[PDB]
């Protein structure tokens, strides 16, 4: 991680190398203004005192100084703008640069690689990690120098002063400089450390909120509710010990600060007084070395960002540097000219990477000539995808050679033997871009009369007639605007505008009706004289009239040759053509009442704190009055331990006052956020399904919502409290007392209160590091990347690296353009505040020394209302930066009181409805109709109608999306139908109690899901809100054949389970479903897709239970394989939602119809 | 320039109460350390009060202490010392004084005022003139002289003409005896002088409020 | 407590010449922080005192620097040079050192000159003072020295009455000299019982009055 420093830099040209060196010197120079401003504040004092002791000479000597306090002035405003702004360019021009590289490097890569890391997270990191190089390379480095100087010249001006006192203040200087810097630290990471906090929670958060129509339908809510309590009790205990530490350093750190002040000027009268200094040298002395000591404290934040920066690199350039086996670009490639269709392939072992235990592939050996329509036969799982796959160079094969005519892939180039294969994948999935450029996205130069000339090669020119902007339709994301039937022959389209050699299809014809599907393979026979050609698909109707048909078994091609020879040969494909013949108020507050205690003290407290800096100036101004009057030396001695008493007292009252202020206020803070978390989550598990339907509410934006919003409204709420009465106490005081002692002075620093407390601000947020807001905006340009990597479909139909490369960079170039003129902005800001406090520093003592000379005022009075006015505006400026944004918390607490006072259309609580004591197992469907409430256009149903009784196990068949969970939905009270009528033995279900018919019945779920917990438990999972015994649990175990793989595993009841069992295999997760809705014992039973990933010999065993238990209940049994559909009792095939047949099986094996071609499609 | 001026004071009966006020103008009054210094017939000195600038620093010695307090009015610049149960040792002037910057601590000294501690009533004294037999012509001069006895306490005053006659004047001090004062005075003028306009002897007895010129003739 | 001692209590010298004051202090004054801390003072016949040196070496802004100060620890000398009759009065030290603060007794100082006979007159009693009971007589020795001078009174020649109140001037800055005055006082009876009474300076100087009145 931490190597290659010199490499991080290694994107810069030489302009930034001159940047950085000239951005330095200004850091330098910047860093050398505060010290020297201490000398000539050190050197005025003197002259005050010696005028006043006597004055018409103290005006003119004050003008002087006042000269050369607005020469530094100066001085650090032109410095200060170059440092930032230098630094902030050189930083911007690399980020860019590496943005623009990395992508680059992201969108090339061998599709194996590719399989081994996360779309998402990869997609994340390059965010993240290039803001963290950023935050960097940016400022820290410059801040850092600038400490730096500033530390070296405070010493050196308190050497050069007076050597003794600067000793001293050595001598205590390392206790201050580690408190600068573990306060920097808190102050930087209180934000991050919540995030830390949480995860634990978070993760189980995540898991079930993604999960959620499974874990509703099975009852486990208030269950999965107790495991969140618990995290989040831990979650709440680390936040306040969190908080208990951060105050308690604070508090010392004050109690330190305080205790310097107190030696230095009990040490500095004992100097004075014997008559070695003066007591304008003690404060240049002091104050020089104490400030040169806080320095120090600023440095860690940059050395730690720093740290993190190399660390984000490392990872990031060896994403970059690391080559691939298969490159995407190569200049070296071989490229042919009298391109020939010939395919050879021989001896072909090739395995994935990203499992390559198993081999699938055990050599398969083909020669292909030209026109040569060849289809491949077999099941679903010998890897017909796999030698498309391999067909396009996607990898390369472990043994053997692969050629195409005459000669060896292995030694030509990839990208033109890439475009010159068009290809179709299982799944088409249409671009956001408008439907033109789609159909463009073939290849460079093409025109509209070759486009119209292409789609009506692919027959998608009626609907693309029928809607608005013909050329100009931005088609939604995935497809989702139109149908799957245009979207595969608008696909099929983007395959043919390539104008190809050789074509691949991979099940073009899955969701297509038999018109489209005619008219497209007529097209395909249209364009297969000059090309060879591959089709892969499930109908036969357009596999007949091909040229080779062949056939997988294991992997192996088996059977060769023509129709009649595989009629002859009667092998699988004579079985097979045997068988086929908003609103925001001021009610965030009335939640926490109950927690008033915590607030009453925590305000008073929060005055306090306030009331300090008066104190401070009152107990300062008057110290240095103590050496300014004509007073003996006892005099002098015994009120200069008086005032160094003070100044202890006030630390040791600043200490405990910030500890209580911190620990009250944050465990109001921590026990907000613990009571919303825990009542969102419950009202999110209550709330409806549908609602987790709408695309506005999502499986992400409800975690997010979770994990900040209920952690904002404490900001708004306390934060609010205290930052006012901190801020009212410190600023209504000061200006008070500086009313009273001198008003014509008070009035000409009012004046420039405001660009003080402005300054505060802006020097906050710059230790803050606060995100930077042009990267914020620049999400915009994210998607693009997002979607380019995420489709990975036209990426592979076409390398398109240059199309959407180049629409990235394009995107990033806008923000780029903003980015310099922040950089300028915000250099111009910061020069011009602190300029601003510097010349504050002289025409508040100029106007002082005027009012001195002529006996309006003292000089004790023009010291105290500099201090009590000018740095407690300073200081409400820094109070109020670490105040979070009222109005984005007060917008979030309006959103999650809109979640809490949701209410649900079905209730979950409630025990009203009709109660009846009996049933017996009777449902009846008539004239149903149901429409998604996300897809309120497209309709799935159109009046279906059933008529079930008691034990007849009724088969569901259809295609894939006619409506074959819809029906249970319909029946587990997920979605109420608008229309239809439902009796469930003469009592309708929208009149009955809503959890009795969700106790009664139980299912397994299309996908199994398993909680966090042991394995026992988790199979267990099903029944709640009764003693749950171990006997039914093994003997549940043992009827579902699960109790054999739990008794051999190690903690055989205890064996913790991971995210959705990860751990263990598919089919016994599936089986320990069965397990899991065995234990409900249901008089309705319904099963989807009960055998998707199940071995055989375990389909028996787990369909002995049933037909053994099929008995006294209603069994609903929804599957692919015919094994369960043959013993039903009566069976029912959906067309479009639409009931065809209905009856015995015998009835539907006499009537030939659809039936007949569903069941016979493997058999004989 | 400074000036200091003191007043109060006077005759007092034992165990009384007097309040001591000095004005000063004309150096920031409100600045300056301020003490009080006391001088005792015995023409002997010693240290009485010192008080901070504007504040609540005092010092006192053994003696004075739990018996004298100091305080300072900054609003019309004003230093008051308030006696309280005044044995009779401690007649005396008192001095204010100032504190000189580099640590010099009496650097600019008022006018000293008088207390008179003792149980005796307020003696006025006789005047009575001196002169010569039937003017006797002296050499080329004639002494005249003035005899003010039987007077308490202390304060008096004397002058010839109003002060109009001070070049040739002794003043000799007050002998104490019996608890009553005497004090002379004498004065040398040409013999052409008082023969022809008569001399006058002017004398003020504050305490009694006595105030007599008693003309000087053959 | 300190106790301040100044050795020369009278400093007689001569017109134009060095004349040093030497006070001793007792417990080596030294303040805390360093500083000795010890001053003199002048005082003039019938002036306030005012200020010569705020410490041992530095002299006071006003001063001739004729006046020199030297000091170590637990003693401290002023060296006056070229005496001039404005310098006549009387010498204190003072020290702020210590938590008490004492003024050292005063030393005198005295212009040396030659001798000077008192130029003596007697006066008899006043009428007003015979009506009420009284007769004081008063004789004056004016612009004499040194001061060491007797005086005595002879009633009917003979007698040498010894009720008498003198009193003496300090030296004056003009000429140097001293004044007395010796007043008689006796009553009016014991004093109509005699016609003859004189003053006489002591080769002495006699003064006298033939009759009480004239
Ligand atoms: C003209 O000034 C300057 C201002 C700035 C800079 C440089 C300056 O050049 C010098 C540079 N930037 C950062 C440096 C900086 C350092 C410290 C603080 N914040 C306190 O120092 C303080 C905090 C208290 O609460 C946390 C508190 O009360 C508890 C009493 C505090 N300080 C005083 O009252 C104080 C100290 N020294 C004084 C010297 C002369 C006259 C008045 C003085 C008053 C704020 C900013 C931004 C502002
Ligand atoms: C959960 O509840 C809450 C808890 C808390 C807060 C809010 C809460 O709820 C919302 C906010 N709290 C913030 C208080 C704060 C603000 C700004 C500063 N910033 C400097 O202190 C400084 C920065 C320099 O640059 C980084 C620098 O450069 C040299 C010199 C600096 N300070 C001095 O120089 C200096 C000088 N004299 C002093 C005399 C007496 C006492 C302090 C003195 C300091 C320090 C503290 C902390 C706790
Ligand atoms: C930020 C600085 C280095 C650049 C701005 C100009 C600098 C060099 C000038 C402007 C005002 C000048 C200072 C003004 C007054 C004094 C006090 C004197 O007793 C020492 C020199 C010193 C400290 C000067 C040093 C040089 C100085 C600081
Ligand atoms: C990297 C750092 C050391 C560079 C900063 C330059 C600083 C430290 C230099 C430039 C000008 C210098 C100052 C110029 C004048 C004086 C006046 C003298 O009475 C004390 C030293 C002092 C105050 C110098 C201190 C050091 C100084 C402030
Ligand atoms: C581990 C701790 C003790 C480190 C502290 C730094 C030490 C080495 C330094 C810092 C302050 C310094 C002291 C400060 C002042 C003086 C007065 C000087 O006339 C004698 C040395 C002495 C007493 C110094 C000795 C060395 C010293 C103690
Ligand atoms: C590191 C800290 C927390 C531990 C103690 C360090 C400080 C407080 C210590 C270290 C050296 C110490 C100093 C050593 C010598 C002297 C000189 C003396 O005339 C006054 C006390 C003084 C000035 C001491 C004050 C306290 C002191 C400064
Ligand atoms: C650890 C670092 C900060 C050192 C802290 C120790 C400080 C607070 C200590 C060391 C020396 C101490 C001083 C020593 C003596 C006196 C005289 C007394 O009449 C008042 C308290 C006072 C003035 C003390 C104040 C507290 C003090 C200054
Ligand atoms: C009391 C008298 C003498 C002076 C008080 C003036 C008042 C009106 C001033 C002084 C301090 C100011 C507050 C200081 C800081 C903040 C936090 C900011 O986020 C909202 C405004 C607010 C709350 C200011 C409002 C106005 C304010 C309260
Ligand atoms: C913060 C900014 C805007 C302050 C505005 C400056 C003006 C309005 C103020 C600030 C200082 C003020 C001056 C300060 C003192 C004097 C001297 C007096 O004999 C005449 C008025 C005069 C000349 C004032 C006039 C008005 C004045 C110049
Ligand atoms: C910003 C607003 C609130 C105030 C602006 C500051 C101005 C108005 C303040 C700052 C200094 C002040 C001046 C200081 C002295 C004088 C001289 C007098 O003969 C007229 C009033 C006048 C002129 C004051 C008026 C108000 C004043 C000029
Ligand atoms: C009656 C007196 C106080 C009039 C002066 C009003 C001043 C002191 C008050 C009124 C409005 C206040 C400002 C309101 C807004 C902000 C922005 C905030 O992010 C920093 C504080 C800051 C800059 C406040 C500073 C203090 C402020 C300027
Ligand atoms: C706050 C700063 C940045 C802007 C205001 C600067 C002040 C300090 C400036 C602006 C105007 C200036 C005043 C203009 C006129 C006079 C009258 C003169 O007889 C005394 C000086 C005095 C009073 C000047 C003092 C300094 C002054 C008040
Ligand atoms: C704000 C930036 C961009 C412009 C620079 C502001 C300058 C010109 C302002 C800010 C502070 C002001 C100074 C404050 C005080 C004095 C003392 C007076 O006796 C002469 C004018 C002088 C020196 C002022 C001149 C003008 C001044 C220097």
Redesign the pocket.
Known sequence: PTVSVFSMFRYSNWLDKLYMVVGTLAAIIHGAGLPLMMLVFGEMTDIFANAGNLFMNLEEDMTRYAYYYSGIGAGVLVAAYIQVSFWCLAAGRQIHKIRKQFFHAIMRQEIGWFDVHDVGELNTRLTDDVSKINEGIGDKIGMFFQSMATFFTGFIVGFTRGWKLTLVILAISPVLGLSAAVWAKILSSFTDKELLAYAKAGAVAEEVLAAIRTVIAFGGQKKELERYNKNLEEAKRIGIKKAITANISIGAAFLLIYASYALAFWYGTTLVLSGEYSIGQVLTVFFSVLIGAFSVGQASPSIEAFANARGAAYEIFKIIDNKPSIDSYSKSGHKPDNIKGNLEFRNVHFSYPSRKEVKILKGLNLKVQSGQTVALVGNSGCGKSTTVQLMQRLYDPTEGMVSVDGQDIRTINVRFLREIIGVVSQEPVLFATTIAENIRYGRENVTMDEIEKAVKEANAYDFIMKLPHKFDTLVGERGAQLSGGQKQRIAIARALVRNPKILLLDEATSALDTESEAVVQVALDKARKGRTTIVIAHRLSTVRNADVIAGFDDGVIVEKGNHDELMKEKGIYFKLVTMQTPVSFWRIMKLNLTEWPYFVVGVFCAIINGGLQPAFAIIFSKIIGVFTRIDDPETKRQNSNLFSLLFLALGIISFITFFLQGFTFGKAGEILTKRLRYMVFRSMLRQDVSWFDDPKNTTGALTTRLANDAAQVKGAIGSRLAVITQ?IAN??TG?IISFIYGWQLTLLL?AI??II??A??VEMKMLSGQALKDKKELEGAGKIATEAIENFRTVVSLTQEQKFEHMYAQSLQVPYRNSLRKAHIFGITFSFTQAMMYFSYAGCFRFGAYLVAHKLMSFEDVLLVFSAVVFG?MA??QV??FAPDYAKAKISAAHIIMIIEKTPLIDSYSTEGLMPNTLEGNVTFGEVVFNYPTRPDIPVLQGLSLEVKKGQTLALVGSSGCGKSTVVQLLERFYDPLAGKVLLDGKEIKRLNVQWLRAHLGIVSQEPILFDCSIAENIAYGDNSRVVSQEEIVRAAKEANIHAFIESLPNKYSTKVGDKGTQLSGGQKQRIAIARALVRQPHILLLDEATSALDTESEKVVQEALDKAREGRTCIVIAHRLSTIQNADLIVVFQNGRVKEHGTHQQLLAQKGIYFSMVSVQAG | EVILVESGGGLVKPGGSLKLSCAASGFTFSSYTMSWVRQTPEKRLEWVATISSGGGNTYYPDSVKGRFTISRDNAKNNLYLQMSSLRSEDTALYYCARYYRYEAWFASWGQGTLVTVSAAKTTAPSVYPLAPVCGDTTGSSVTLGCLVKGYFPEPVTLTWNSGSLSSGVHTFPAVLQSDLYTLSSSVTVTSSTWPSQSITCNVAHPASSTKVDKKIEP | DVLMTQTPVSLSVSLGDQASISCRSSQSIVHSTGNTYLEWYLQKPGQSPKLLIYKISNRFSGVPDRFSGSGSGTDFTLKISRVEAEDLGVYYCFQASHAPRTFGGGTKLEIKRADAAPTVSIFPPSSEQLTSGGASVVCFLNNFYPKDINVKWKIDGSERQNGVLNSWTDQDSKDSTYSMSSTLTLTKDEYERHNSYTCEATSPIVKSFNRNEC
């Open positions: 801020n600023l209504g200006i009012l209160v405001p407390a402005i505060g601000v505006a409400v400026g109020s930066s």
